[PDB]
Structure 1
Amino acid sequence: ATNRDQESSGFAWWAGNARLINLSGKLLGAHVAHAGLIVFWAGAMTLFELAHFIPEKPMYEQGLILIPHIATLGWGVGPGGEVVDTFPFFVVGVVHLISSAVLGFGGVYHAIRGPETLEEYSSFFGYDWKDKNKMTTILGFHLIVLGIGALLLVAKAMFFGGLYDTWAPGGGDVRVITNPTLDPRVIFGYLLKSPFGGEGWIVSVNNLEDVVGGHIWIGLICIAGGIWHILTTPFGWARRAFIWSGEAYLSYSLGALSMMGFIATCFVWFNNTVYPSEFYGPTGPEASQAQAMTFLIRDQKLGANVGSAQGPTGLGKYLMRSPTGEIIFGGETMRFWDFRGPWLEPLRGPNGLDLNKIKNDIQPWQERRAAEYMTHAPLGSLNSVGGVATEINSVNFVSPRSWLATSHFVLAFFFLVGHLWHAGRARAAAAGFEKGIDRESEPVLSMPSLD
């Protein structure tokens, strides 16, 4: 039992996985077995979703989070996002589930059967956390893999059927992307946009040409950086800035994952391009704008002049100006005037919502789309009673956008806590006082008094 108790290892059972820090062979097993769990869930959950899926109900009425991801890539859907073929969902699930047994197998072997340390067995697979050259080489391999992964999305988009495009003329459809945006001013201009309202940083990406072109740039950058880090070793300024240890490296990744979880939380809450509302339900801004649209349409049909209807506050009951003059929906949804969506943009003119188009060009499919989104607003209780907190039981609904945003905020928050925990500990362990203050060497006793 090498390092398998508290006396030999110094770590109690509740920190038991810390006993693996310098046992690269068992550590490899732990990571591979764990990836099997990830792949297992992906395969099993997809099959569960498919078994429970009724093609005549919108996905977002059915508690689906994985099938919407598959459908967005262009598999199984046609015009308007209608499901034409559920077999791709079946394949994706089966293949992930079968692969998890391979990964589970290798994970269990390395964890309990294979060599505990890899350094004696292979200098290629062996590593020392302090070997800055080896660590950047391992990092370089994984950047190349990630870069290839980004290019697979480009290949799907350009050569293997395309992607679902919520903005496609005619109500949304799978479309092959023939001219991805390559202009670096566009691609990197997204990175310098303010993250506040009306700008939205990278969350504002609103067309597939930018999405595909960005992944071309990311693929190349990752492949180049992966080669760079195979061939180089950290420079002197870098060497002096960091802590070089297993726990330190873990803490940096925890910081990175936390940041990414917060970004994903906002992506799914605001973006309706790579999270099409056909599959995920309307965004919060979207459903709120759709209510104003619904009642503008109802009241205009009854003979109201909605352009000149003064509401109780003095602002337009249906229409008003944004702080920069654009014509926008009134009521409390004035806050959401930055919303853009395929069902709304035909009413937009250079000055914002166009009154002539409102009076003359509203099509029945827009009325349908706005009434559907208004009644699937992402509001609901923890037991999945749809609607405002004061609604009665009847509708079993919570938007996928709420499930995905809340879950990833919670996860991103705890990963930020994990970063602080492990970064603070890595610093203390490197300097040598993570177990407490040396009584005979207490630093404060050598310092001058404050007063």
Structure 2
Amino acid sequence: TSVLSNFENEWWAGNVRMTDLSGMLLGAHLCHAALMSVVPGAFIVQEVARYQPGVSLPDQGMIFMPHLAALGVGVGAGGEIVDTYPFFVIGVLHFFIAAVCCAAGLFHTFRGETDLNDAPDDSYAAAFRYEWDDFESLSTIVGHHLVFISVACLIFAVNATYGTGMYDINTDTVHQISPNLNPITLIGYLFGFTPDGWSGAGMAAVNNMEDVIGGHFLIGVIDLLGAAFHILYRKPTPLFTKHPVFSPANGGWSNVGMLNSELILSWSVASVGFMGISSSLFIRYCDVAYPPVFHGVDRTGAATLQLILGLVWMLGGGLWHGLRGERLYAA
């Protein structure tokens, strides 16, 4: 099925069988998202069930409550959990999202048409036809997903600034913090250029909520602009086409800029692993975004967990799928 390595039709590899089946692939992703959303809500409800008021969160071993309390959910002045009901509401809403995703996945795996190339010729569904070769098709997908991520980030920032704000570590309580919008100052962190001097952990030495909220505004605007870029153009440019790549497809650097299913998957996997490593640094050092009132002070274990996951995705998955895609570029 669009691959001939040695073992394409093995049951333990059977997911590759959906390489071209667009409808089934969409269903599979939706079901997976159902899993990813079931876990948080279920474990939040389980946590709130055993939560004790006198003891502090770091001493209760909660791995989802701290992230919710960091956003001012159910906490008051002094950083103590007051009311537990909003955590329960968050869990229930994740249950709802998971149920909707699972319904969609069941529809597209069984009721929906397996391959959208078999859609009835502009039936609201041919507009969703995509091919792992044509660039234009996948461009609009990237654009719309960027739209959603950007709207999420902007919503987070707007909530922080105007409505009910976040738990600011320095001010000791939940406040609508006034954002900092000095773009050079924000983008300096990416090279470690913190105001207090260069720092080893980029983006992680922020010492005030204003920096993070301004950065989120910047990221939201940037992602919205990129969404417009990809939705409105869909055409390959001399950046993607005609860029150097080293591969045994042709021994040595080439300017081909190849495209393939495994290659797209590999770039995505590498991106995820990189985010894992960046988050590792973040939770190791940045305690503005992780108030030790909630997550505790010692946080080497969580950072190491993130590190391992990031290495597995960036090195293992990224390399494996990149090599397979480059080899499949011998078609």
Q: TM exceeds 0.5?
A: yes
Partner of 1:175: 175
- Pairwise CA distance, 1:403: 4.3
Q: SS of the counterpart of 1:80?
A: coil
The residue matched to 2:24 in structure 1 has which SS?
helix
Rounded to whole Å, the distance in 2 between the matches of 1:39 and 1:100 is 5
Q: 1:406 aligns with which of 304, 312, 322?
A: 304
Matches within 5 A, 1:71-110: 71-110=69-108
Identical pairs, percent: 37
The residue number in structure 2 matching 1:185 is 184
Decide whether the 8 Å contact of 1:79 with 1:174 is kept in 2: yes
User: Quick one: which of 417, 428, 446 aligns to 2:327?
Assistant: 428
Q: Are residues 1:16 and 2:14 paired?
A: yes
C-alpha displacement of 1:411: 1.2
- Which contiguous aligned blocks of 4+ residues in structure 1 show a shift greater than 6 angstroms? 194-197
Task: Tell me, yes or no, if structure 1 residue 141 matches structure 2 residue 150.
Answer: no
Q: Summarize the alignment of residues 345-384 of structure 1 with structure 2, pairs less than 5 Å apart.
A: 378=298
Which whole-Å CA distance do the structure 2 matches of 1:64 and 1:239 have between them? 48
State the Cα distance separating 1:406 from its structure 2 match: 2.7
Shift of 1:194: 6.2
1:307-330 deviation line (CA, Å, top 9, x unaligned): xxxxxxxxxxxxxxxxxxxxxxxx
Matched residue SS, 1:160:
coil
Shift in Å at residue 402 of structure 1?
4.0
Return the offset for 1:159: 2.2
Aligned to 2:166: 163
Q: What whole-Å deviation, never above 9, does each CA across 1:184-237 have from its counterpart, x for those lacking one?
A: 111111112269984421111111111111111111110110010112212134
**What's 2:253 paired with?**
none
Asked if the contact 2:270–2:313 (Cα under 8 Å) also holds between the matched residues in 1, the reply is yes
What are the equivalent positions in structure 2 for 1:34-433 lying under 5 Å apart?
34-121=32-119, 122-168=125-171, 172-177=172-177, 179-193=178-192, 198-232=199-233, 233-241=235-243, 242-282=257-297, 378=298, 401-416=299-314, 417-432=316-331
Q: Distance in 2 between matches of 1:112 and 1:58?
A: 47
Distance in structure 2 (CA, Å) of the matches to 1:119 and 1:223: 30
Contact 1:139 1:226 (C-alpha < 8 Å) held by counterparts: yes
| Offset of residue 130 of structure 1 | 1.0
TM-score calculated relative to the size of structure 2: 0.88
Q: TM-score, normalised by structure 1?
A: 0.65
Q: Is the 8 A contact 2:57 2:295 kept in 1?
A: yes
Larger radius of gyration: 1
**Contact conserved, 1:120 with 1:126, CA < 8 A, in 2?**
no
1:78-121 Cα offsets, whole Å, 9 max, x none, are 12211111111110011101221111111122112211011232
**Secondary structure of 1:209's aligned partner:** helix
Letter of the structure 2 residue corresponding to residue 68 of structure 1: P
Structure 1 residue aligned with 2:251: none
Deviation, 1:409, is 1.6
Equivalences, count: 305
- 8 Å CA contact retained: 2:201, 2:281: no
1:20-57: CA deviation from partner (whole Å, max 9, x where unpaired): 11000000000000001011001101111111211211
Task: Output the CA distance in 2 between the equivalents of 1:147 and 1:198.
Answer: 28
2:133 match: secondary structure: coil
**Cα distance in structure 2, aligned partners of 1:164 and 1:119:** 50
For structure 2, list consecutive stretches of 5 or more residues without a partner in the other structure: 120-124, 244-256
Aligned to 1:386: none
Tell me the secondary structure at the aligned position of residue 56 of structure 1. Answer: coil
